[PDB]
């Protein structure tokens, strides 16, 4: 199945707009993903990683993005922070896998990269498996902002500052999470 392209995409979407792809009616050979020698983090909830290819599911979803290393720990169920609460929420009844590996070589330049953004202001925390991509001047206080920045009017998105000289805790990591679903429909993927 075309897991090769999802794991070899030249560019990855921003955290606040995680890139989602659907896979169904295929033949699953997950071992190929182990081609990448490095893996900073590799975990699975609900399924043993060694017996992934011996199961049958209705379909799967791959959600990929790029984050900072010290935030990679916020991609587990029942977590909290500035990522798990406003950019990507995992329901407790989670059955899937999460993979994260460093991307210092390809996603860092001396000048400084501002192509990756993450949300920083929001009124309420996101529901599990939900997305919100709507640029708008966040308003604080009773006064109306009228769509202009100022004392209590800010830009929700914040731009990561990437430089090759940053520490290990700031070099970007590519992250991909696979979610499996099985339902009344026939078990196609196997």
């Amino acid at each position, epitope marked *: 199945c075309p897991f090769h392209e999802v794991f070899n995409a030249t560019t990855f979407a921003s955290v606040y707009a995680w890139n989602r792809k659907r896979i169904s009616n295929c033949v699953a050979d997950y071992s190929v993903i182990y081609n990448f020698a490095p893996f900073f983090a590799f975990k699975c909830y609900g399924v043993s990683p060694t017996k992934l290819n011996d199961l049958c599911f209705t379909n799967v979803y791959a959600d990929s993005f790029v984050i900072r290393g010290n935030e990679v720990s916020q991609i587990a169920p029942g977590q909290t922070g*500035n990522i798990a*609460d*406003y950019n990507y929420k995992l329901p407790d009844d989670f059955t899937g896998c999460v993979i994260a590996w460093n991307s210092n070589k390809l996603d860092s330049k001396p000048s*400084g990269n501002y192509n990756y953004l993450y949300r*920083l*202001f*929001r*009124k309420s*925390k996101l529901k599990p498996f939900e997305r919100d991509i709507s640029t708008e001047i966040y308003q*604080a*206080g*009773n*006064k109306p902002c009228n769509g202009v*920045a*100022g*004392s*209590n009017c*800010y*830009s929700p998105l*914040q*731009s990561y*500052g990437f430089r090759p000289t*940053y*520490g290990v805790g*700031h070099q970007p990591y590519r992250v991909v999470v696979l979610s499996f679903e099985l339902l009344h429909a026939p078990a196609t993927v196997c």
Partner: antibody, heavy 115, light 85 residues
Framework: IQQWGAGLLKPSETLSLTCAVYDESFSDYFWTWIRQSPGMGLEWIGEVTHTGSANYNPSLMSRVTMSRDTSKNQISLKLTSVTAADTAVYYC???????????????WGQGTLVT | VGDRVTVTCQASQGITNYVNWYQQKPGKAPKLLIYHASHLETGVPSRFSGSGSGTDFTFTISSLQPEDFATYYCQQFDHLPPTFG
């Protein structure tokens, strides 16, 4: 937090102060400058948000000028016209942005006095 | 002095829910004790607290420890510019 600048001045000139931090998360916090006249309350000068901007107090709008420096992680404050009515002590303050609320001024520098 | 003390802060024009309470000592930089009404900073042992909206904000202390001698200050967030007291 560290600070420095000009200590003794003469009326009708310009003042420049610099506030420097010693961490690496100097990209996601609001940074404000506080002025305190000798033994008389406090005053609010201006602030710089996360995305390299600035908001100035209306009374001192034109005179004041704030700026950042991400390469060395510093903040610069400039006053165009100094006099004998601006003698005070200046503090460098930080605000951490939370979700829908801002914990204004949760950390203050030692500051410095000017005449 | 000794057991209890209570202070009040008021606003003339406009109402708000945002206020802060700071502490000062002889020649040291001010510290923030309370932010956003009753919400407390994680540095407040001796029950420094105060809760109230509607232009009648209050600051209350349960007991006076040996290191409680300051010039506590109010503050505002909204209605730019912020003004102290």
């Amino acid at each position: 937090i560290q600070q420095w600048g000009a200590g003794l001045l003469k009326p009708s000139e310009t003042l420049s102060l610099t506030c420097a931090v010693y961490d690496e998360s100097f990209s996601d916090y609001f940074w404000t400058w506080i002025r305190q006249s000798p033994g008389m309350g406090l005053e609010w000068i201006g602030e710089v948000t996360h995305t390299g901007s600035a908001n100035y107090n209306p009374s001192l709008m034109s005179r004041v000028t704030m700026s950042r420096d991400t390469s060395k992680n510093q903040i610069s404050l400039k006053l165009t016209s100094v006099t004998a009515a601006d003698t005070a002590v200046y503090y460098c303050a930080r605000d951490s942005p939370l979700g829908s609320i801002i914990k204004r001024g949760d950390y203050w520098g030692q500051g410095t006095l000017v005449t | 002095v000794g057991d209890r003390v209570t202070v009040t802060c008021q606003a003339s024009q406009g109402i708000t829910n945002y206020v802060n309470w700071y502490q000062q000592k002889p020649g040291k930089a001010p510290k923030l004790l309370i932010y956003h009404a009753s919400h407390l900073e994680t540095g407040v042992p001796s029950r420094f607290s105060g809760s109230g909206s509607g232009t009648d904000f209050t600051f209350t202390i349960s007991s006076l420890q040996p290191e409680d001698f300051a010039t506590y200050y109010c503050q505002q967030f909204d209605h730019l510019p912020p003004t102290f007291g």
